[PDB]
Amino acid sequence: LFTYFREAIVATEPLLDILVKGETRIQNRVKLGLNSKMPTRFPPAVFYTPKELGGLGMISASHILIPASDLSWSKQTDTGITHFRAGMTHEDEKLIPTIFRYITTWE
Amino acid sequence: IKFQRENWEMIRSHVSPIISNLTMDNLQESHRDLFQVNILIGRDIICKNVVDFTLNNGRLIPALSALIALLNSDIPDIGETLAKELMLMFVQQFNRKDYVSCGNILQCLSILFLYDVIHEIVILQILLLLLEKNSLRLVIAVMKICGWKLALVSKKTHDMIWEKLRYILQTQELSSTLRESLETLFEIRQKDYKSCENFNELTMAFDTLRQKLVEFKKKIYLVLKSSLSGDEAAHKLLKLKIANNLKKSVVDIIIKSSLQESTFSKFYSILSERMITFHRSWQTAYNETFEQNYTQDIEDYETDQLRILGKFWGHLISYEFLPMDCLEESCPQGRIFIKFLFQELVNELGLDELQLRLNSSKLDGMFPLEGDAEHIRYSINFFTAIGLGLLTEDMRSRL
Amino acid sequence: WSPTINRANVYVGFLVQLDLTGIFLHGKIPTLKISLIQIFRAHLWQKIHESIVFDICQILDGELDVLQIESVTKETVHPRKSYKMNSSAADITMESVHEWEVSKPSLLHETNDSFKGLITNKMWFDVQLRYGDYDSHDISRYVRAKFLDYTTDNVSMYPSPTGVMIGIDLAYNMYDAYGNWFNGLKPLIQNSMRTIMKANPALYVLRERIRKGLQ
Amino acid sequence: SYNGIGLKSAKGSSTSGHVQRSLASNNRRRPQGSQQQRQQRQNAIKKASIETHM
Amino acid sequence: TDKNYYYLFDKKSFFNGKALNNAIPGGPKFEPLYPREEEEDYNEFNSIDRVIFRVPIRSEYKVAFPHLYNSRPRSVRIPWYNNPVSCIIQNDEEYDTPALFFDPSL
Amino acid sequence: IESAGFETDLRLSTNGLGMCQLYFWHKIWRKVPGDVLDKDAFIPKLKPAPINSLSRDFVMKTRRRKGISTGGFMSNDGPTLEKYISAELY
């Protein structure tokens, strides 16, 4: 997804939303295996920690503070980046880096 | 005895001098000076000096009060004497219709009360006296001065005073000015004041007394990298609300991060822009960083990194920054950085337009206008090396 | 990730104690339990605890006359006492020759002490195993808490009011003890504990099992 | 949703639905002066430009 | 004791918010009653070509004048619109005193 | 204009201690700040405009609402002969 449209992701909010959702779903799959999904019992440690420290080693694009906007004025007319939405999880102020910042934008 | 007298005289003079001096700019110094000179044998003199000063700056009454308090803490007798003198003065004022004097004295008293020198009882008495003769102008300012304090200590007394004031306002044919004063007082209340034989021994005592008296960086990096657009990153940074000290450091870190990435990204530039718009301190920090770069940190970098940096700077400068730039000897890495920056500018702006913009700013370093004995030749050559105009024109101009 | 996945700060997990062990599971977590069982197969927890007790006894025997010890009685506790986390009991009761001047309830790693508070003729050691977990992995604190609880309320099957609660976090390999001490005891005790941690057979076995589980 | 801007609903989302207002927003708002830096320049560029009844 | 305190923390206000899918930031939030059918289709009404933006029209104002500021309100109850409560209680054990306020002119 | 959600806002601010009321019986009109008949005018579409161009923007909006101006961008001027007297003699 990201290597194909590196630069072009940032603007599209729907895609971002999907990523957030998709990532969460994936996480829950793992948590489904462990028959819980209790949000404390899976700190981001267990997912994003690499396999070389025993983690799953996911490559998140979910911890981004998504651009929210006036959906009144978004589809209509014009736009600007104001009010960020949550992004994906409760964090312990643990800023998980995002794959996009390690991919050189197409231009 | 003669010697003692002389000493006293000297002391008095010193006190007078201190009084004359006393201001906000050199208060500590004044205090120090005062401490140096004796005021047990020359206690009366000191008192006289203080009182005189009060009579004079009335605006620096608080300071005087503080000084008195300080003195009192050490030598209480002197303080007591001063208080007595003040009281006497007040009495005199009351007697003789010396209104200004009364006001001054009252203020002093209030100050004393505030600093735990004199009791609030005296103040209360004064207020009562003022009331008895229908003198609103005297008690109004005094009350204001020692209002909160009064409330704290003798609340009942304060209440009584308030009641009296109210009575005066309503159950007495008061003047317009008086009424106004009353109103003001009320307003203040609503907010609670918003605005010798043993000479040698003594000397010895006084002298004794005188003698007695990486993680952050990491976090920043994470923030930079845990963020989709630059905007988000900027927002995150701003959330942190780091001190005006560390802004420069943050900027430096950001720059480093940018350098680290393989090629120049719009992201970093965007972030910078966001920061810059946000506050003057961030702008200042950015400027500082820039200065550091071309001066001392530019020659350290490898080429690609340097180029990237230049590009970033160009982007910053194409719009957001003011074109302020400080540029034979200075030509290796630095020159290439400059070239890169120029290229970036060209890309952003448009050649002629860019040139015009450059002209508009003072700009002596990038394009020095004065010929200066074939020193501009080098600059021209450099310009030629990276496709540019106006250099030729400049050359023609000088001959 | 057991020590995060199973942990104390759970929202709604019904805390079952796992079979023949002191390993609380906050809710049915699937593979974890099996792994734990494998680790602690053949009553391993009990063995560990008992082994530790034995070691302590041996140590005491070695240093009898140095610390003025009349007799070192290992009490005949109920087999599950190792893994009864609610209650407790004095494992190694300890008779004195002369009267000990013990300190106030304090930790095993404390440089500053005062041996003029309480006095006693009899003492006890309790060994308390626990399986740690990310939230409550601090062992010392836990032991202190236990001491505060057990010693005070009604009767906690201790013959003397004064004693010590040794505690070994099996899942973090941390150890700490807390309680009352007499002069020269504490350093020795610490040393003994260290030795045990380095090499107790049961503990070693446990470690091996854990390794196997983890691969 | 607060000022037309929050995420419609907390469910589905797969997220807190928390909404920090951005501090880029402020920046975006504020460049009246920045417009003058450009606006001002523009202005400068184009700056120079009955009796019977009575 | 001041009743006016509960402005936009009324049950009615809450209900309105729920209806309008509009959180008073302090208060609760729910699944919207009605699904947000974003099918304006760039019409000549409510366009940004047409309207003016002196006021930001906060969602605070929505639940206060539901039928006005919000367009297509549904199942929206009417809120209250109140008087101010000058009520002074003495905490220092005193009796009938003009303390917090100021005296008449005459 | 500015008095949209004024009272409510005030109430929110003041924890319902101050109660505003707005009225218009003085019939007191006033110049909208800024200057109509300016084609440069303002920057923002979404935000509130600046005060020199405030008059203009409002007028434009009104025109749009009416259906006087035809399109996304337009102007206002006098219809007369001779190119409006040569743009008022330049």
UniProtKB/Swiss-Prot annotation, chain C:
Q: Where in the cell is it found?
A: Nucleus
Which positions, given as ranges, span the membrane? none
- For this chain, the annotated S-S bridges are none
Stated consequence of mutating D91N: No effect on viability
Chain positions covered by the region annotation Restriction endonuclease homology domain: 44-215
Miscellaneous comment text of the record:
Present with 468 molecules/cell in log phase SD medium.
Give the domain note: The MPN (JAB/Mov34) domain has structural similarity with deubiquitinating enzymes, but lacks the residues that would bind the catalytic metal ion. Contains a region with structural similarity to reverse transcriptase, presenting the classical thumb, fingers and palm architecture, but lacks enzyme activity, since the essential metal-binding residues are not conserved.
Q: How does it assemble?
A: Component of the U4/U6-U5 tri-snRNP complex composed of the U4, U6 and U5 snRNAs and at least PRP3, PRP4, PRP6, PRP8, PRP18, PRP31, PRP38, SNU13, SNU23, SNU66, SNU114, SPP381, SMB1, SMD1, SMD2, SMD3, SMX2, SMX3, LSM2, LSM3, LSM4, LSM5, LSM6, LSM7, LSM8, BRR2 and DIB1.
Protein name according to UniProt: Pre-mRNA-splicing factor 8
Q: Which organism is it from?
A: Saccharomyces cerevisiae (strain ATCC 204508 / S288c) (Baker's yeast)
UniProtKB/Swiss-Prot annotation, chain D:
Q: What span is annotated as the signal peptide, if there is one?
A: none
Query: Member of which family?
Result: Belongs to the CWC21 family.
Q: What is this protein called?
A: Pre-mRNA-splicing factor CWC21
Q: Which domain of life is it from?
A: Eukaryota
Full-protein positions shown: 2 to 68 of 135
- Residue ranges with Low complexity bias: 32-42
Print the miscellaneous field.
Answer: Present with 556 molecules/cell in log phase SD medium.
Q: Please give the organism.
A: Saccharomyces cerevisiae (strain ATCC 204508 / S288c)
The subunit structure is: Associates with the NTC complex (or PRP19-associated complex), composed of at least CEF1, CLF1, ISY1, NTC20, SNT309, SYF1, SYF2, and PRP19.
Q: What does this protein's UniProt record list under function?
A: Involved in pre-mRNA splicing. May function at or prior to the first catalytic step of splicing at the catalytic center of the spliceosome, together with ISY1. May do so by stabilizing the catalytic center or the position of the RNA substrate.
- For region Disordered, the annotated ranges are 1-53
Q: Can you say where in the cell this protein is located?
A: Cytoplasm; Nucleus
Which residue ranges have biased composition labelled Polar residues? 11-26
Give the taxonomic lineage as stored in the record.
Eukaryota, Fungi, Dikarya, Ascomycota, Saccharomycotina
Curated annotation (Swiss-Prot), chain E:
Organism (species): Saccharomyces cerevisiae (strain ATCC 204508 / S288c)
Name this protein carries in UniProt: Pre-mRNA-splicing factor 8
**Subunit arrangement?**
Component of the U4/U6-U5 tri-snRNP complex composed of the U4, U6 and U5 snRNAs and at least PRP3, PRP4, PRP6, PRP8, PRP18, PRP31, PRP38, SNU13, SNU23, SNU66, SNU114, SPP381, SMB1, SMD1, SMD2, SMD3, SMX2, SMX3, LSM2, LSM3, LSM4, LSM5, LSM6, LSM7, LSM8, BRR2 and DIB1.
Q: Where in the cell is it found?
A: Nucleus
Q: What does the comment on domains in this protein's record state? A: The MPN (JAB/Mov34) domain has structural similarity with deubiquitinating enzymes, but lacks the residues that would bind the catalytic metal ion.
Lineage of the source organism?
Eukaryota, Fungi, Dikarya, Ascomycota, Saccharomycotina
Give any extra note attached to this record. Answer: Present with 468 molecules/cell in log phase SD medium.
Q: What does this protein do?
A: Functions as a scaffold that mediates the ordered assembly of spliceosomal proteins and snRNAs. Required for association of BRR2 with the spliceosomal U5 snRNP, and the subsequent assembly of the U4/U6-U5 tri-snRNP complex. Functions as a scaffold that positions spliceosomal U2, U5 and U6 snRNAs at splice sites on pre-mRNA substrates, so that splicing can occur. Interacts with both the 5' and the 3' splice site, as well as the branch region. Has a role in branch site-3' splice site selection. Associates with the branch site-3' splice 3'-exon region. Also has a role in cell cycle.
Give the residues of the full protein shown.
Answer: 323 to 428 of 2413
Curated annotation (Swiss-Prot), chain F:
Name assigned to this protein: Pre-mRNA-splicing factor SNU114
State which gene encodes it: SNU114
First and last residues shown, out of full length: 909 to 998 of 1008
Briefly state the protein's biological role: Component of the U5 snRNP complex required for pre-mRNA splicing. Binds GTP.
Q: Where in the cell is it found?
A: Nucleus
Q: What else is known?
A: Present with 300 molecules/cell in log phase SD medium.
Q: Which organism is it from?
A: Saccharomyces cerevisiae (strain ATCC 204508 / S288c) (Baker's yeast)
Q: How does it assemble?
A: Belongs to the CWC complex (or CEF1-associated complex), a spliceosome sub-complex reminiscent of a late-stage spliceosome composed of the U2, U5 and U6 snRNAs and at least BUD13, BUD31, BRR2, CDC40, CEF1, CLF1, CUS1, CWC2, CWC15, CWC21, CWC22, CWC23, CWC24, CWC25, CWC27, ECM2, HSH155, IST3, ISY1, LEA1, MSL1, NTC20, PRP8, PRP9, PRP11, PRP19, PRP21, PRP22, PRP45, PRP46, SLU7, SMB1, SMD1, SMD2, SMD3, SMX2, SMX3, SNT309, SNU114, SPP2, SYF1, SYF2, RSE1 and YJU2.
Family per UniProt? Belongs to the TRAFAC class translation factor GTPase superfamily. Classic translation factor GTPase family. EF-G/EF-2 subfamily.
